[PDB]
Design an enzyme around this catalytic site. Structure first.
Site: not given
Lengths: 725, 419, 432
Positions: C97, C417
């Site tokens: 991500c 995250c």
């Protein structure tokens, strides 16, 4: 030897073609000589077992000389003669005791192909500039050096015909798989010497290795055609099959030619009468029917259209000071995107602007699809396409205009509008920036009025569809600057167009000369004649489009927009039919695109096989009767042509047309003037500077209208005079 | 010398798995599996603590979709910490280099003291359906959801081999070679040097970088597979492989499909010594460049060598050790030619005089990629590692490592030995 | 009021201007595109808006997670199409991500290093499809390498005794190379920190509404429109779809059924998108005549244990960087975090606000500090806009400095995250 050089390495000679000017190696008489000499040396010399011949000139390999074609053109068989003397040389090559490898670098057309076609082994570079072709046809002639005999034998009867009928150039790779070239080689990157040069060297080095090998008789590794090509090729052995091919072709040519062009038909013969009779019968049929053509009226005409095209692809005014590096098109319509694409793909970083986002897309799509189609046709890489498309930065507001070097207007034909835009734009673009207007009716003066700087305002009248068309009519007002023009010309040429320059007028050369016909058309349609008959009457006279279906396509309404806007400015001689029936269409609700006899099936605008069901009813209402000596089918034709031809020559007279060549180029390439005739200015020189007037006076006093010869037309009539020569 | 106020960075030790011929014995492994092995070989030999490793970064070109971040998944299996973050980097043949660069950058930056660079590549492709797998992405009107596709479907195959700007890697070699007039004989020649000069270095045991590796299937592997020198009369009896039939580039004078991985422990000098290590070299200056892929993609070094050599402030003479990437025989021999041309230098490189032909005697002395192997993005390390390795066992101070890469790119670095 | 400054002898680095393609719901309208095609678009939207000269760009670097095997080095191939130079080298970076982040860091690292002055960072991700064959593709290739004249047909008889117990093979990806769904961890990372269903559907709704607001107000400046060859053209995002809280609760669970807290509506979604950014050293940015939007201040990468705490990136990351720079939750007045799942943040909050957790796991004195839920994702976040892996990392920092201008403030904290059991946080200092 100013053309053909010499040199040898091992048991392999290395001939080197390079003309004196070097620009492009063409087949001169004196070159032919030097060559004919150099062969005899390497032929007889027991020192040499094999040989090569490559072009030193980087631009190309060979092109074939038009230098002495119409120059040494004396009798019908002083040309026929030439053809033979050529056939003789290549036959020596073909039937050589020493293998000869043709190392084809760049352009290899006409003559050139007919040579490498005789040589033992053809080797060509995988380059875009490396094209093979037999464009002989396009000049109303045909291949006069074995082409009609060797190509069929080498590349099957079909492709060999297509190649010599369409005159299409063939891509290197296509030519390879096609069987035209024996072996292919990719060009090299940078090295110790520049690319081109080092490439040439490599090509030679390779051609030699092949040459050497051929002398040793070591060439048993041929290719396979497969199952399809093996069958089709076999099927072509059967004589009654070949008949069905010569027929289906002749038919196709016949009907797509309308039968006005001789070469395409005589080529179908010479091929047949050589592969059905003896090669000896062929070569000597080719030789004769060659010169037989070169003398034909058509060929003469097309050579003129060819030449004019050469000039019209060169900058009349030379380089400008500032090379347009940032362009901006105004109107993502059709002729906007059309124009954009023709500019973007060239490398010009262009800016497409429009009002609504919706209309900015349509345009952006065309220019995309356009590129994407060029990918499928194998002319552009998927990557090249995508990449090219980045150069096209589309927008609604003028953001980058601050840096515009040129600007092109492509909005509606409304002068009020044309002004609003010119004002806005000129307020944000630099001082050096040109402004060009893609208009047809409105003059570049009445537009350049509001101009803060009318020196930089110049007309650029493109032709539709701009994707495919290549004519560009650059208009010039008096205030217009020279450099401002010398840039507009240089841009159109980069866009890869054929350029014709005219002085501003009320309806410039093209649109103007077009008008009188569109009137005479209405009149004829109103005289009892109908679309089918009129379409057929003009198409079969040489016109690419039927006079009526020309309109039904162009703009049933945009007909009036200019018929009356330009009819008001003249109306004197332009007075043909009644523009009421022309109105009765719009107001009663008729249009090209739907209702009017030129429609198409389902939501896909598909098929034809249909006209109009009602324009008959309204036509019948108001329609005059015929005449006696002017109702003739042949007369109906010249009615149109003459009126055009007149306004055309008149535009030369008035000084609008700089030259007759330009006058012709534009007329043929833009108006669809039958090219067999050679352009309206040629048509005078050939059909008769007098006979054309007598024919015109017969559509003047006999038709009680002032459709009378101008001064310069009647001037040539009263003497033995010709415009072009 | 080396720079002053910028902190110095050194290679403690490096390693690599044997470089095997693709489809040989790593056949039934995944790319991260090799990476794991390399990382373990390093972690074992270097005896680093699993704790102090601040960042790991690996290079690789062809992705195992299951292990997107190849580094991160190999890092965990190897043993290194949960804390020790990692990322995977992809830059063609020089992906393993970018790994070390991207890592070094974080050191001098100050962002960390200890990092593990390296890379991995497994050549045994993975071909898909670009839309067999799209009416396939639909997972009593439900049954007929598929008649809607079965309306007429024709799937078949994928891609992968050429180049996203069109052209084979080695095909460019055969015409990059001809462009600089490099002869067939000249190529088969060098090819043979690296195969022999490697086999020699192997026998002598100079190939220290290579840690053995126990494969679950096979017995176990220590040696490389590309060691296969022939006679020059043999390499010439061979046919061309990319431009037929008048080609100069053959199978024998070209590199080959290779499975392999490489790891390296790079850290800041102050730490390496404080850790009680005896650094093998300094990671001095370096430079990344780029070309025009179409006509000159394999000329990385020629453009790269100068930019770094001058940025550090040395010359062809200050350098006594050259470890270049051997993509193809004709790739180097031609790169040489270009470096040795004032013309090319003046015209394209845009400079005064030529770059300077590196002494063909200080060049790839323990063989190179053509003989050992070229695992994309795992070969970038083996070079710098077998450069500082030569500077020790042969002697010297300054080594120049450089490599041509697909993407029309190139990379060069200066390796300064350690006392 | 707050300790404010930046470092001295180390050269300063700024973001001139950033951009991104509209973040669309995967399979929506970027369906028939390739990842590099979006990257190309983002790069062009940057090159146009920023008006950078194609010449000065010293290094490009893009992030992405799922690879188009045809465009291995996604960045390098989109870079050429866009217009940037041949010279301008590039490499593609992958880090889950936060791949778009590693693109800026890897780039920033080369600037402070001195290796170059001007770099373009960014990323791209097209949720399309990348399934493949195994055996059918092994038995696939060994039908390649040529034998005598044709005699490799026995190499196919061993072949036709292969597919006998199972037909062929054919996998792909979704889980995690250490077993577990991304969102399945969310549903039990949430429950681990006692984050209720109602609490989640609640935040979810904030980001959808607060995004739709920001959109209407036009605060989403980062988005450059994009003309897709197929579709008309796109300006707006697709994830803008706020609902009633009474509706988001009427919904079923999506990862842990049937007692699940995580639903479709309180989760992010498959999104196609690309993002670009022009980052360069201050001395150049000003010399170029630019008006920088922010400073790229301090940053930190961290990692967790993927098995039981993979989505706690920020909790571990936020401090390390916040202290390394030398500030606190207070010095910060602008938080742009990645919204993987409603229960992902709400639970990260809980962990940052626990002294216990801080003491036990983070190994520190007292808690990290719950960032004011009022200075947090004010122009919406990933859950409402979209999360194109490795193209979302930029949209954050870009919509951080963007908030510091149009809302006012100096210090912004961006943190995210990531899968791989990793995380990243960065300090963005506004510019005068």
């Amino acid at each position: 030897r100013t053309h053909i050089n010499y040199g040898v390495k091992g048991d392999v000679a290395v001939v080197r073609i390079n003309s004196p000017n070097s620009k492009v190696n063409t087949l001169s008489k004196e070159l032919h000589s030097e060559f004919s000499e150099v062969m005899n040396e390497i032929w007889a010399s027991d020192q040499i077992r094999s040989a090569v011949l490559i072009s030193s000139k980087p631009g190309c390999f060979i092109a074939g000389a038009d230098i002495n074609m119409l120059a040494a053109c004396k009798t019908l068989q002083e040309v026929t003669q030439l053809s033979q003397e050529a056939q003789r040389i290549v036959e020596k090559l073909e039937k050589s005791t020493k293998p000869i490898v043709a190392a084809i670098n760049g352009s290899c057309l006409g003559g050139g192909l007919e040579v490498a076609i005789s040589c033992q082994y053809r080797i060509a570079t995988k380059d875009r500039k490396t094209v093979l072709g037999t464009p002989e046809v396009l000049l109303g002639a045909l291949p006069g050096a074995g082409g009609t005999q060797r190509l069929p034998k080498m590349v099957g009867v079909p492709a060999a015909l297509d190649m010599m009928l369409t005159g299409r150039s063939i891509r290197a790779d296509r030519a390879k798989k096609m069987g035209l070239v024996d072996q292919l080689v990719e060009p090299l990157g940078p090295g110790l010497k520049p690319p081109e040069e080092r490439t040439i060297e490599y090509l030679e080095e390779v051609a030699i290795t092949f040459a050497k090998g051929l002398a040793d008789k070591k060439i048993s590794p041929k290719r396979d055609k497969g199952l399809v090509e093996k069958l089709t090729a076999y099927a072509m052995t059967i004589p009654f099959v070949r008949q069905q091919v010569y027929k289906k072709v002749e038919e196709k040519v016949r009907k797509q030619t309308k039968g006005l062009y001789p070469a395409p038909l005589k080529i179908i013969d010479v091929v047949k009468t050589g592969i059905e009779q003896g090669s000896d019968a062929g070569y000597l049929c080719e030789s004769q029917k060659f010169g037989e053509l070169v003398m034909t009226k058509e060929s003469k005409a097309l050579m003129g259209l060819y030449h004019g095209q050469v000039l019209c692809k060169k900058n009349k005014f030379g380089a400008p000071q500032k090379d347009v590096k940032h362009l901006a098109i105004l109107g993502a319509g059709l002729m906007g995107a059309g124009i954009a694409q023709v500019s973007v793909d060239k490398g010009l970083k262009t800016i497409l602007k429009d009002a609504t986002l919706t209309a900015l897309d349509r345009g952006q799509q065309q220019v995309f699809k356009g590129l994407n189609d060029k990918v499928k046709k194998k002319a552009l890489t998927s990557f090249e396409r995508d990449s090219i498309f980045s150069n096209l930065t589309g927008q609604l507001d003028y953001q980058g205009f601050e840096k515009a070097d040129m600007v092109i207007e492509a909005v509606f034909e409304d002068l009020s509008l044309k002004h609003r835009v010119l004002k806005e734009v000129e307020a944000v673009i630099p001082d050096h920036c040109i402004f060009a207007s893609n208009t047809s009716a409105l003059p570049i003066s009445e537009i350049a009025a509001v101009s803060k700087r009318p020196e930089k305002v110049i007309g650029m009248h493109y032709f539709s569809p701009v994707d495919k068309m290549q004519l560009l009519e650059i208009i010039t007002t008096e205030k217009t600057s020279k450099d401002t023009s010398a840039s507009a010309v240089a841009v159109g040429l980069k866009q890869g167009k054929v350029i014709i320059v005219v002085k501003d007028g009320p309806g410039f050369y093209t649109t103007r000369c077009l008008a009188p016909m569109m009137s005479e058309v209405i009149r004829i349609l109103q005289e009892g004649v109908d679309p089918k008959k009129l379409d057929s009457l003009t198409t079969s006279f040489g016109f690419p489009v039927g006079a009526a279906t020309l309109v039904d396509e162009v703009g049933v309404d945009v007909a009036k927009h200019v018929a009356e806007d330009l009819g008001k400015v003249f109306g004197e001689r332009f007075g043909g039919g009644n523009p009421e029936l022309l109105t009765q269409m719009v107001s009663k609700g008729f249009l090209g695109r739907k209702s009017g006899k030129g429609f198409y099936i389902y939501q896909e605008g598909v098929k034809r096989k249909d006209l109009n069901s009602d324009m008959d009813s309204i036509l019948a209402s108001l329609k005059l009767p015929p005449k006696s000596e002017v109702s003739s089918d042949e007369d109906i034709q010249f009615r149109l042509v003459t009126r055009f031809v007149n306004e055309a020559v008149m535009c030369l007279q008035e000084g609008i047309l700089a030259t007759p060549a330009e006058g012709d180029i534009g007329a043929v390439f833009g108006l669809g003037f039958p090219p067999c005739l050679g352009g309206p200015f040629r048509f005078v020189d050939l059909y008769g500077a007098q006979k054309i007037v007598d024919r015109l006076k017969k559509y003047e006093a006999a038709y009680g209208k002032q459709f009378t010869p101008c001064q310069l037309l009647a001037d040539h009539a009263n003497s033995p005079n010709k415009k072009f020569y | 010398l080396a720079k002053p106020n910028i902190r110095n960075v050194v290679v403690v030790d490096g390693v690599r798995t044997p470089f095997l011929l693709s489809g040989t014995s790593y056949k039934d492994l995944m790319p991260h599996d090799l990476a794991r092995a390399a990382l373990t070989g390093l972690l074992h030999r270097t005896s680093v603590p699993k704790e102090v490793v601040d960042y790991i970064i690996f290079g690789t070109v062809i992705q195992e979709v299951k292990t997107s971040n190849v580094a991160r998944e190999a890092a965990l299996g190897a043993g290194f910490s949960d804390k020790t973050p990692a990322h995977t980097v992809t830059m063609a043949c020089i992906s393993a280099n970018q790994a070390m660069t991207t890592g070094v950058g974080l050191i001098a930056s100050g962002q960390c003291d200890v990092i593990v660079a390296g890379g991995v590549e497994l050549m045994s492709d993975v071909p898909i359906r670009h839309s067999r797998k799209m009416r396939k992405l639909m997972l009593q009107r439900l049954s007929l959801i598929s008649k809607f596709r079965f309306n007429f479907l024709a799937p078949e195959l994928p891609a992968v081999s050429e180049f996203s700007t069109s052209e084979t890697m080695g095909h460019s070699a055969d015409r990059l070679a001809a462009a600089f007039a490099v002869s067939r004989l000249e190529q088969d020649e060098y090819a043979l040097r690296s195969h022999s000069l490697a086999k020699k270095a192997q026998d002598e045991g100079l190939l220290s970088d290579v840690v053995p590796f126990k494969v679950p299937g096979k017995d176990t592997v220590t040696k490389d597979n590309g060691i296969r020198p022939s006679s020059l009369e043999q390499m010439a009896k061979l046919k061309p492989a990319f431009i037929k039939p008048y080609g100069t580039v053959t199978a024998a004078n070209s590199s080959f499909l290779t499975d392999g991985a490489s790891a390296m422990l790079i850290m800041a000098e102050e730490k390496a010594l404080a850790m009680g290590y005896k650094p093998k070299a300094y990671l001095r200056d370096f430079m990344y460049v780029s070309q025009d892929p179409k006509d000159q993609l394999l000329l990385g070094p020629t453009y790269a060598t100068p930019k770094v050599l001058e940025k550090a402030g040395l010359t062809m003479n200050d350098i006594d050790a050259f470890e270049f990437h051997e993509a193809f025989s004709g790739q180097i021999l031609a790169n040489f030619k270009a470096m040795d041309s004032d013309w090319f230098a003046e015209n394209y490189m845009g400079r005064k005089t030529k770059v300077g032909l590196p002494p063909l005697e200080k060049f790839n002395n323990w063989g190179g990629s053509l003989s050992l192997g070229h695992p994309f993005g795992a070969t970038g390390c083996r070079l710098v590692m077998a450069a500082a390795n030569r500077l020790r066992k042969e002697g010297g101070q300054y080594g120049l490592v450089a490599a041509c890469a697909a993407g029309g790119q190139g990379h060069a670095m200066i390796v300064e030995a350690y006392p």
